[PDB]
Design a binder for this molecule. Structure first.
Ligand SMILES: [Cl-]
Ligand SMILES: [Cl-]
Ligand SMILES: [Cl-]
Ligand SMILES: [Cl-]
Ligand SMILES: [Cl-]
Ligand SMILES: [Cl-]
Ligand SMILES: [Cl-]
Ligand code: NA
Length: 129
């Protein structure tokens, strides 16, 4: 599924991402925009042979099992395929684990490089939340 901007903001708020570990909802929407363009079916193969999955491009090296990332972990205890669902529950639950890991949202290179320090509230402007 390709979410609308305000549609995704609403889904992320209902699943308790708004101000999760102190990151306002606009941070999460900005991250999803540059990671996946709001497309739950987004995938990206890394040079190390790991893969990124779903709206927040969660990686198979630590967070999910895809059966093809040698030596990897599955800390969210999910198949990577769950991260491509039209239902973002698995993606939000796993993101909560990642953002708790010690580096906050810096875990998302695209958030650091394109969202951090910007007017992220722009991403929820207009939305009935
Ligand atoms: Cl947009
Ligand atoms: Cl915000
Ligand atoms: Cl594996
Ligand atoms: Cl594991
Ligand atoms: Cl699995
Ligand atoms: Cl959803
Ligand atoms: Cl933090
Ligand atoms: Na894995």
């Amino acid at each position: 599924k390709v979410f609308g901007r305000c549609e995704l903001a609403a889904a992320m708020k209902r699943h308790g991402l708004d101000n999760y570990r102190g990151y306002s909802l606009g941070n999460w929407v900005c991250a999803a925009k540059f990671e996946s363009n709001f497309n739950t079916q987004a995938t990206n193969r890394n040079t190390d042979g790991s893969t990124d999955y779903g709206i927040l491009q969660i990686n198979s090296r630590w967070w999910c099992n895809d059966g093809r990332t040698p030596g990897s972990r599955n800390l969210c205890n999910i198949p990577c395929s769950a991260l491509l669902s039209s239902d973002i529950t698995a993606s939000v639950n796993c993101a909560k684990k990642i953002v708790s890991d010690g580096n906050g949202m810096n875990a998302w290179v695209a958030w650091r490089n394109r969202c951090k320090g910007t007017d992220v509230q722009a991403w929820i402007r207009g939305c009935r939340l």
